[PDB]
Amino acid sequence: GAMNSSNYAELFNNDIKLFVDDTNVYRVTVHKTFEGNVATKAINGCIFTLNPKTGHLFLKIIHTSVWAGQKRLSQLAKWKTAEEVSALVRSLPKEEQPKQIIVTRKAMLDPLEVHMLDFPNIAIRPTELRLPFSAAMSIDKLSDVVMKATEPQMVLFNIYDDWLDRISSYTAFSRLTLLLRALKTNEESAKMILLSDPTITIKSYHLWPSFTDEQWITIESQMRDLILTEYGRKYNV
Amino acid sequence: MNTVPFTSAPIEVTIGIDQYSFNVKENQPFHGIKDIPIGHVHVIHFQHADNSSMRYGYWFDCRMGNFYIQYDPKDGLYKMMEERDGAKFENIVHNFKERQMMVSYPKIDEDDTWYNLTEFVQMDKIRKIVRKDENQFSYVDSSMTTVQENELSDPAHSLNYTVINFKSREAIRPGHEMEDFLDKSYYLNTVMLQGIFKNSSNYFGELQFAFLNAMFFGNYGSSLQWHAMIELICSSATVPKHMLDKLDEILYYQIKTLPEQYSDILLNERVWNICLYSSFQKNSLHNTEKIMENKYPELL
């Protein structure tokens, strides 16, 4: 059933599973028109499909052309997301196909379930956790590739860079959500913290900097402190 | 006018015929129901005073034989049975009616209620849903399960309703995923109407039969079928205008006949608010809408 803090470590056993976050599929700007009415402009989006155990990220870029001449777009976005996750499952060899897909938002359940009818042994599940995958377009290289695309396009990443060479999935996945949590709450600060020291660089094939073990501790301490600071400010505590 | 005699009334039971019902006391000399209109289906049913669980009954039509009722003390319940000896049957009927030990089917002549609830119900469709083809009548009770429940155990005792599932390959054309799941017209018109049911009248009949099984026996799966056939129509943007207008009359009389105190288990909040206020067909159940709002405003 639903995924929560009880059944949290299931994410890390050897059953293939994917998270599907659809918060950045349909992205608009809001502006005034010449007659003073309000209009939207769409920008490029991305389906955010992640294997929390291995770090494999399937970043489906949603080109603004997909929206052209369509109504009820925010509704269509859900169905387009379930279309593309399906095509992705079909594109993978059987032994790689997930046994479960966990949607970060309950409104994706019915579209995915419908589009996955050809895969009845693939359980579609909701979650009660509050994952921070909308902050994914705070990662400079994810946002750049999304922004620069000219057609629908798929882009593979490992969102853990090379961390699994030295830490477990559990820990990896905790670093990730910590970083995205921080970037969601106060992007400017989160990024300041990550990039302050110019001598620590991002490998061209990586997304985050090449911190040493000791530095990842200092970083994780500093992201924790950020997230606490912003909550007090949010509620006066 | 037809009759359904009873051999005897050994145990205290509440007896029902159609939407009518009587209390019969233990070994009261009771011997049957007379003046039953030929022309529709009927249902006779039972609730023992000792076990207010399991209501049970028989669906039938006098035009298909001469049926009577006898208690079976081994099985502890009243059984419907056919008499094949025509002469022998009219004989026991005339003797008991002369002895006047029979209640009369109490039909006020202004009342079209029974006809309105059974208009599309046919015995032959019924005996496909309750498969037991060594009897011309059909047995139902509170606990019997449907074929769709069985899938999600004993099949001889199954209600073989037509299986409707909005998230199935049947209901969803590949490539029209979004379209078909928001707008079920495909499923309704081609798959179900044209395909399985053949005409709107068989459909209405199953829907109508499922409602009554729910009302008389509290058959929870019958409730589920009835609601789903309603949802399929209401969640379709393209429905024959004759079917909308008939459905408004069908539902009106169902809602009108329902015991007031049972509204909570028998009406599914979601389906009805969808039909009457969210679906394509909101505007199209003026009669059903008006009666729901004045009788069960709380559910909404």
DSSP string of A190-222, one letter each residue: HHHHHHSSTTS---TT-SS----HHHHHHHHHH
Distance from CA of B156 to the nearest CA of A (A): 28
Q: Are residues B149 and B274 in the same domain?
A: yes
CB neighbours of B134 closer than 8 A, spacing ≥ 6?
A: none
Minimal Cα–Cα distance from A230 to chain B, Å?
41
DSSP category for residue A187: H
Cβ within 8 Å, pair B168-A113: no
Q: Do A115 and B177 touch (CB under 8 A)?
A: yes
A79 contacts on B by Cβ (under 8 Å): 177-178
Judging contacts by C-beta atoms under 8 Å, the chain B residues touching residue A111 are: 177-178
Residue A227 has which token pair? 């997230």
Whether residues B102 and B174 share a domain: the answer is no
CB B4 within 8 A of CB B33: yes
Q: Which tokens sit at B23?
A: 């209390």
Mutate to test the interface with A, among B165, B170, B177, B186 (most CBs of A within 10 A): B177
Question: What residue segments make up the domains of chain A, in order of their start?
Answer: 9-163, 164-237
Tell me the C-alpha distance between A118 and B173, whole Å.
12
- Residues B119, B174, single domain; the answer is no
Shared domain for B279 and B299, answered yes or no, is: yes
Partner-chain contact B178 A79, CB within 8 Å: yes
CB atoms B167 and A114 under 8 Å: yes
Beta pairing class for A100-103 and A17-21: parallel
DSSP letter for A85, please: H
Are B172 and A114 a contacting pair at CB < 8 A? yes
Helix, strand or coil for residue A86?
Answer: helix
Pairing of strands A45-50, A17-21: antiparallel
Q: What is the DSSP letter of A159?
A: T
What tokens appear for A200 in the block? 């620590």
Q: State the nearest Cα–Cα gap between B179 and chain A, in angstroms.
A: 10
Q: What is the rounded distance in angstroms from the CA atom of residue B56 to the CA atom of residue B207?
A: 20
Tokens 């849903």 identify what position? B129
Q: Residue B97 is which amino acid?
A: K
B95: domain CATH number is: 2.60.34.20
Domain boundary at B91, B119, B143, which? B143
User: CB–CB of B177 and A79 under 8 A?
Assistant: yes
3-state secondary structure chain B: CEEEEECCCCCCEEEEECCEEEEECCCCCCCEEEEECECECEEEEEEECCCCCCCEEEEECHHHCEEEEEEECCCCEEEEEEECCHHHHHHHHHHHHHCCCCEECCCCCCCCHHHHHHCCCCHHHHHHHCCCCCCCCEEEECCCCEHHHHHCCCHHHCECCCCCCCCCCCCCCCCCHHHHHHCCHHHHHHHHHHHHHCCHHHHHHHHHHHHHHHHHHCCHHHHHHHHHHHHHHHCCCCCCHHHHHHHHHHHHHHHHHCCHHHHHHHCCHHHHHHHHHHCCCHHHCHHHHHHHHHHCCCCC
- Are A114 and B168 inside 8 Å of each other by CB? no
Distance CA B80, CA B60 (A): 9
End residue of a domain, out of B143, B170, B195: B143
User: Residue A156 belongs to what H/E stretch?
Assistant: strand A153-158
Select from A114, A118, A122, A124 the residue whose CB has the most chain B CBs within 10 Å, as the one to mutate to test that interface.
Answer: A114
| Cα angle B144-B60-B87, degrees, rounded to a multiple of 5 | 135
Cα B178 from Cα A10, distance rounded (Å): 31
Structural domain of residue B22, as residue ranges? 1-143
Q: B149 and B138, same structural domain?
A: no
Chains A & B: contacts with CB separation below 8 Å: 21
Extract the tokens encoding A77. Answer: 């976005």
Closest CA to A176 of A7, A6, A17, A11: A11
Q: How far apart are CA A84 and CA A62, in angstroms?
A: 10
Residues 6+ apart with CB under 8 A from B58: B43, B44, B45, B67, B80, B137, B138, B139, B140
Of B231, B118, B215, B219, the C-alpha closest to B164 is: B231
Q: What is the experimental resolution, given in Å to one decimal place?
A: 2.1
Q: Do residues B11 and B30 both lie within one domain? A: yes
Q: What is the number of structural domains in chain B?
A: 2
Residues of chain A with Cβ-Cβ distance to B169 below 8 Å are 117-118
**CA of B190 to nearest chain A CA: how many angstroms apart?**
19
* Cα–Cα distance, B126 to B299 (Å, whole number): 31
Which of A78, A117, A118 is the best mutation test for B, with the most CBs of B within 10 A?
A: A117
Q: Do the chains contact at A82 and B177, CB–CB below 8 Å? A: yes
CATH code given to domain A164-237: 1.20.80.40
Instruction: Please give the Cα distance from A20 to A82 (Å, whole number).
Output: 9
The DSSP 8-state label assigned to residue A134 in this structure reads G
In this structure, the answer to whether residues B135 and B260 fall within a common structural domain is no
Q: Measured between CA atoms, how close is A117 to chain B, in angstroms? A: 7
Residues A117, B168: C-beta atoms closer than 8 Å: yes
Q: Domain check: are B154 and B299 in the same one?
A: yes
How far, in Å, CA of A225 to CA of B23, rounded? 76
Which residues of chain A lie closer than 8 angstroms to B178, CB-CB? 76, 79, 111, 114
Residue A83 with chain B: CB contacts under 8 Å: 177
Instruction: Tell me which residue has tokens 């056939």.
Output: B229
Domain boundary among B79, B111, B143: B143
How many other CB atoms are there within 10 angstroms of residue B133's CB atom? Answer: 8
DSSP string, A65-83: GGGTT-SSHHHHHHHHHHH
Asked if CATH classification 3.30.420.230 holds for the domain at A9-163, the reply, yes or no, is yes
Cα–Cα separations (whole angstroms), residue A16 to A58, A95, A100, A114, A126 = 14, 9, 7, 21, 16
* B60 and B148 part of one domain: no
* Same domain (yes/no): B30, B77: yes
Collect all residues of chain A within an 8 Å Cβ-Cβ radius of residue B167. Answer: 110, 113-114, 117
Could you say which DSSP state residue A127 is in?
Answer: B
Residues of B in contact with A73 (CB under 8 A): none
Residue B222 sits in a domain whose CATH number is: 1.25.40.550
The answer on B183 and B124 residing in a single domain is no
Do B136 and B167 reside in the same domain of the chain?
Answer: no
Residue B291 identity = I
Chain B: closest CA distance from residue A80 (Å):
9
